[PDB]
Design a protein around this ligand. Sequence first.
Ligand SMILES: *[C@@H]1O[C@H](CO)[C@@H](O[C@@H]2O[C@H](CO)[C@@H](O)[C@H](O)[C@H]2NC(C)=O)[C@H](O)[C@H]1NC(C)=O
Ligand SMILES: *[C@@H]1O[C@H](CO)[C@@H](O)[C@H](O)[C@H]1NC(C)=O
Ligand SMILES: *[C@@H]1O[C@H](CO)[C@@H](O)[C@H](O)[C@H]1NC(C)=O
Lengths: 50, 99, 49, 79, 49, 47
Amino acid sequence: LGKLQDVVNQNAQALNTLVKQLSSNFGAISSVLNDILSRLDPPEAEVQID
Amino acid sequence: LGKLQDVVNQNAQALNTLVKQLSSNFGAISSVLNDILSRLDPPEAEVQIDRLITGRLQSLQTYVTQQLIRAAEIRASANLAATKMSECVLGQSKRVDFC
Amino acid sequence: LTESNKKFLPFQQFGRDIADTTDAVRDPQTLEILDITPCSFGGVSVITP
Amino acid sequence: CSNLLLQYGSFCTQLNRALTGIAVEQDKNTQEVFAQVKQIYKTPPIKDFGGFNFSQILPDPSKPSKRSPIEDLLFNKVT
Amino acid sequence: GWTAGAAAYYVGYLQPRTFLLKYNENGTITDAVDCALDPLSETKCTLKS
Amino acid sequence: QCVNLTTRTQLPPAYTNSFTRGVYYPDKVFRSSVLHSTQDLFLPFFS
Ligand SMILES: *[C@@H]1O[C@H](CO)[C@@H](O[C@@H]2O[C@H](CO)[C@@H](O)[C@H](O)[C@H]2NC(C)=O)[C@H](O)[C@H]1NC(C)=O
Ligand SMILES: *[C@@H]1O[C@H](CO)[C@@H](O)[C@H](O)[C@H]1NC(C)=O
Ligand SMILES: *[C@@H]1O[C@H](CO)[C@@H](O)[C@H](O)[C@H]1NC(C)=O
């Protein structure tokens, strides 16, 4: 079946892309904010979290 | 023919708007990245390049959103045309004021 | 650089289009108008049985 | 620029997927409108319909194009 | 006592304004329409036609 | 060297109206069938 399969595959792949979006640096020096929080002082940390 | 001319003009004007958006600075000191690459070293020019990237990405996202809305409208019109083709052309439709 | 068939007025150097892209230039030696065209681009597509 | 787009490659993948879906959507849209019959029929050589003049909507073999004069006029009307 | 024949000259002052210029196939200016002179001119120059 | 003139009867300056005058090429580029708008110093029409 074609019509019943795309409506599930597109949603699953969009959810996979949403999950993968957390693995990107987004122009920063790290992906997870906890590394900056445990490594940087709060004035420099808040810029990376922003 | 109004509808075809309007949709063609809308697509062409959106494409030209994207082209002219490529010629924008988005608050930076220049539009083209080659000028800033030649005039400023990359260790000091990453912020302006990132701002240009963000502006072009926003332009691309808006273009994709408008194209998706236009494609949905075109699909609705095509479905209406297909139903009319199946009913009024491929037989006689008893639906008054439909064909 | 393609040999164009359009002449230029004798006070201009460059030439642009509707999209503000410089696609026409004049050689500064013996007055030849040469077009500017992007080289080549595209995408490889795979047909699988 | 590509080195910095490595962080936005997922967004570019989403836009490319949306554009490919739009292209295949417009490709599929013609099939349910015009491809309704899987057999190509033809008109008789002698046009005797009792008085109904069908030459305007029927294609004319005088021109190299298969378009009817009404459809050719429609083609010339819209840019 | 002197003579100078017949002559006349005009002097004008330029100010910054926005003008929409029409170009032909030869690349020569034919007509110009303002944007802060007439509402019809503003409508013409805003539509780029 | 120069000499000075003498006081005589002159005519006061008058004012006339321009009619689509004072238009020049604003750039050294070529545009064909292009309706292009630029910000440059021109002479206003009917001024
Ligand atoms: C059907 O209508 C067409 C109109 O397009 C008729 O074609 C015209 O016929 C007249 C009569 O000889 C000519 O003077 C015109 O030049 C024709 N026009 C074109 C565009 O061909 C045609 O004769 C009609 N047929 C019938 C059977 O009535
Ligand atoms: C410039 O000099 C060269 C060499 O003499 C000549 O071939 C060319 O025509 C000249 N260009 C001019 C005069 O515009
Ligand atoms: C300007 O272009 C027109 C359009 O073909 C042509 O008839 C005319 O001869 C051209 N004039 C010059 C000076 O090239």
